[PDB]
């Protein structure tokens, strides 16, 4: 399912957690038009000084102004030959809806 | 000339809802919603939990 | 070399706190301007914007 | 089938003296909330101080 | 029968008459569409439920 949002405002918790629950384990994309966010454009080395849990992204206040990061990870060099492999993926979930 | 008037300011109605909850389905924890959705809203999405 | 990114900002040493503006968010934000009245605006208002 | 879309006031008259402003103000006020006129007012005191 | 009369009684005495009470005017952008619909303008801030 592509599932867009149109509003947010009273969705139930047990929903919320229902549709991303649906975004990882049946591959739902969900576009979540109510959402204003500043978006600081970080470089690899600072990573991620802020974190945000779905919850979060599913119930901040419809005025409110979230503050994403994003990686602009295209300055980060080449594993050494020798690094062990790494076994497990590094996942993502949110992303912007344009530029 | 006259005191014709009080002058209430958050007017009561002669009818209100009330409600029986059955407790057992009932979560007493108040609902929450945005702010200011809930300063509208609120009232209402509580006494008909 | 190494500048990983180089953006164009307002220029915050010009527009001012003393204009009431906060550029540290990458937009301008003004604290009282549109607001609710009767209640506490909230911080991160996007009206701020 | 119609393209709703925004038209200055320059492009019809050809009286510059009576044109001040652009597209542009529409644009801005197209961001801004539905404004009361106590809001209003509140903004115009905000930007007195 | 004399519990109504006296209901009768106060509801013809209710000489009550109405000023604006504290009222807030939200920012319509915080505004759940459905309630932005419902809502003009300004409210009381006893809403009262319905």
Same mark, same amino acid.
């Given at each position: 399912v592509h599932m867009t949002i149109n509003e947010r405002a009273g969705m139930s918790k047990l929903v919320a957690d229902n549709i991303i629950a649906s975004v990882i384990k049946s591959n739902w994309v969900v576009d979540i038009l109510d959402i204003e966010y500043t978006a600081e454009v970080m470089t690899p080395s600072e990573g991620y000084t802020q974190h945000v849990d779905a919850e979060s992204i599913m119930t901040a206040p419809k005025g409110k102004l979230f503050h994403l990061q994003f990686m602009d990870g295209l300055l980060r060099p080449e594993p050494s030959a020798f690094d062990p492999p790494a076994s497990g993926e590094d996942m993502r979930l949110i992303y912007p809806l344009q530029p | 000339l006259s005191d014709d008037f009080k002058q209430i300011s958050d007017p009561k109605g002669y009818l209100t809802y009330s409600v029986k909850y059955e407790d057992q389905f009932t979560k007493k924890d108040k !609902?929450?919603?945005?702010?200011?959705?809930?300063?509208?809203?609120?009232?209402?999405?509580? !006494?008909?939990? | 070399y190494g500048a990983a990114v180089v953006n164009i900002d307002l220029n915050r040493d010009f527009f001012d706190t003393a204009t009431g503006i906060d550029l540290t968010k990458g937009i301008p934000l003004v604290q009282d301007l549109l607001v609710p009245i009767g209640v506490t605006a909230g911080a991160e208002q996007s009206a701020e914007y | 089938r119609y393209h709703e879309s925004v038209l200055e006031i320059a492009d019809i008259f050809d009286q510059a003296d009576f044109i001040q402003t652009s597209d542009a103000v529409r644009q801005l006020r197209a961001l801004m909330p539905t404004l009361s006129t106590s809001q209003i007012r509140h903004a115009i005191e905000r930007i007195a101080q | 029968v004399s519990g109504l009369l006296m209901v009768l009684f106060k509801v013809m005495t209710d000489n009550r008459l109405v000023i604006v009470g504290e009222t807030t005017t939200p920012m319509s952008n915080t505004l759940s569409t459905v309630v932005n619909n419902v809502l003009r303008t300004t409210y009381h801030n006893n809403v009262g439920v319905n």
């Open positions: - | !609902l929450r919603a945005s702010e200011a959705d809930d300063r509208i809203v609120g009232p209402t999405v509580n !006494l008909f939990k | - | - | -």
